[PDB]
């Protein structure tokens, strides 16, 4: 069960924690989406599909930085939707391909601020996902930890739109 980040980072078979650098829009108004769409940055695949067929879940989520200052949103995984970090465990998706396969995850965002300036701390850690992997042949239980790194400081629109 190998994997690779679109930036060239790769976690070998067995587990580990890796860093991904994702880009974000320079300006988000009142709740557009501020999505990450990690389905173009992480690609895991299976080793021996003849007998070993992998099953990939999102074990847990966590948020850090300016998201935990004033933000909210949802998370997508294979035609579903959950709130900010999943308090429950989402179901499994079968990885059974000896080929590249985008991981269908995202992170929707929306500002709960009323009057603020800078947001999403640049170069900081936006979120952490924990790819849990099981199989149909062994009790293999590891954690591909992925750490979302902010690439830019997202600026909330300035003051205005007020009445007496």
């Amino acid at each position, epitope marked *: 069960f190998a994997c690779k980040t*679109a*930036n*060239g980072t790769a976690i070998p078979i067995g587990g580990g924690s890796a860093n991904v*650098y994702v*880009n*974000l*829009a*320079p*300006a988000v108004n009142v709740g557009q989406n501020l*999505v*990450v*769409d990690l*389905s*173009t*940055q992480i690609f895991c695949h299976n080793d021996y599909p003849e007998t070993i067929t992998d099953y990939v879940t999102l074990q847990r989520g966590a948020a850090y930085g300016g998201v935990l200052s004033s933000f909210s949103g949802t998370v997508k995984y294979n035609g579903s939707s959950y709130p900010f970090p999943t308090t429950s465990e989402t179901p499994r998706v079968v990885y059974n391909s000896r080929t590249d396969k985008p991981w269908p995850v995202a992170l929707y965002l929306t500002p709960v601020s009323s009057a603020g300036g800078v947001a999403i701390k*640049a*170069g900081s850690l936006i979120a952490v996902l924990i790819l849990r992997q099981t199989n149909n042949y062994n009790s293999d239980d590891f954690q591909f930890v992925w750490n979302i790194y902010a*690439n*830019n*400081d997202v600026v909330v629109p300035t003051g205005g739109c007020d009445v007496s």
Partner: antibody
Amino acid sequence: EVKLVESGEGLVKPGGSLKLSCAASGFTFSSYAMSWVRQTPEKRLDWVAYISSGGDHIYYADTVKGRFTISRDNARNTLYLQMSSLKSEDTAMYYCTRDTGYYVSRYFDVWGTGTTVTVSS
Amino acid sequence: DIVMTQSQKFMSTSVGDRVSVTCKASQNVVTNVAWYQQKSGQSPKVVIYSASFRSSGVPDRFTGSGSGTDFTLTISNVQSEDLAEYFCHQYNSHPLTFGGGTKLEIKR
């Protein structure tokens, strides 16, 4: 005003190397990353290289990796694209631009004068 | 890579018209496509970053849109000096690659 001065042109035989020199003016260098992009003359643009504002994060595209190294000094205020192992024409219009690299989103905001690279016999 | 495909020709437009310039992604680029204006053998200038916001020094006659796989740049009114090559670019998947560029032609 912000300007990106450029120097260090020269024809190169295949298997050689050149040091492309680029300097800046009008801002604080340590807070902005830089990038190198080649504009083939009125033709296909290609992103050559990226370097962080500090110099710790350094990536190259598939067409230039294994042949290029880059560096910068914050105080000296001069980039250096030290490129070698020449192959496959490469004849472009190389150009240093201030891309707002990591800790900001990629823009390639301002460009300077640019230099030319020719690979012939 | 992610080929940022765009029309391999120019788009005819007389003065006073509206310019629409296409740019097509084979793979899913999330958002944040840049648009530059490059004249005859000169430096490209940052015009529309992230395909939705204007840059400083760029007039209000400029704008654009696009998401998913399809992006477009637009000129509300074409003055005499605006006509040049116009470049679309993606930077949400390494290696970040530019578009083919679009040539602006007057009809006379």
